[PDB]
Amino acid sequence: MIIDSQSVVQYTFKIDILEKLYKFLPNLYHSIVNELVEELHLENNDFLIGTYKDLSKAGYFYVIPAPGKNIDDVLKTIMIYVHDYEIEDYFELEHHHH
Amino acid sequence: MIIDSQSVVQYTFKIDILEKLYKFLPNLYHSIVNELVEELHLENNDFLIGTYKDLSKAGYFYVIPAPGKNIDDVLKTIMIYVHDYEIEDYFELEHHHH
Numbered sequence A, B: 001m002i003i004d005s006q007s008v009v010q011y012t013f014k015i016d017i018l019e020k021l022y023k024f025l026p027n028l029y030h031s032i033v034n035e036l037v038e039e040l041h042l043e044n045n046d047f048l049i050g051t052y053k054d055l056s057k058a059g060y061f062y063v064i065p066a067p068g069k070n071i072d073d074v075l076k077t078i079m080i081y082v083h084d085y086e087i088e089d090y091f092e093l094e095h096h097h098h
Helices: A016-024 A027-045 A072-083 B016-024 B026-043 B071-084
Strands: A002-014 A047-051 A058-066 B002-014 B047-051 B058-065
Touching: A002 A072, A016 A027, A027 A047, A027 A072, A027 B002, A047 A072, A047 B047, A058 A072, B002 B016, B002 B071, B016 B026, B026 B047, B026 B058
Parallel strands: none
Antiparallel strands: A002 A058, A002 B002, A047 A058, B002 B058, B047 B058
16 A cells, blocks of 8 residues: 655756747647657656646646656756757748748 | 756555565565566556665555556556466465475
């Protein structure tokens, strides 16, 4: 059974480029964020990550590192996966939307 | 970047039959607990689980459910995997050790 409990930290990590993608191509944003979260979970066993329900927090992720896992290492891993989508590419065509 | 943080709960779940296995067949215990943790992580994406470094806590696991995940559901899942090892079997032969 459960015999004890203690507080652990849950971080809110803002990923600027994803928040901006959401503002411009929300549907693409949804696709990328869900593959991102799935792949991070499939390839990493030492942290939890997820989106928030509030759309005002689109682009923000909750992050919970396992005991003994360095939060800053988790962020580096998340960003490596994020950079791989080369989201910068999309903003180059945003002007067609004016 | 990190823009906020909050406290989340980390539970200590004692698994009696594993604690008892550790007391009698520590090496088997080590093998089972490490496959258990690996399989729970591979097949479940909504909670973190792990052993503690203190051997006095052998048989106890830290458990951190993702936001919105019901801790009691996590325990049921853990026990399903634990029961599958049929650890009761081992204690039947413990008397040969007297």
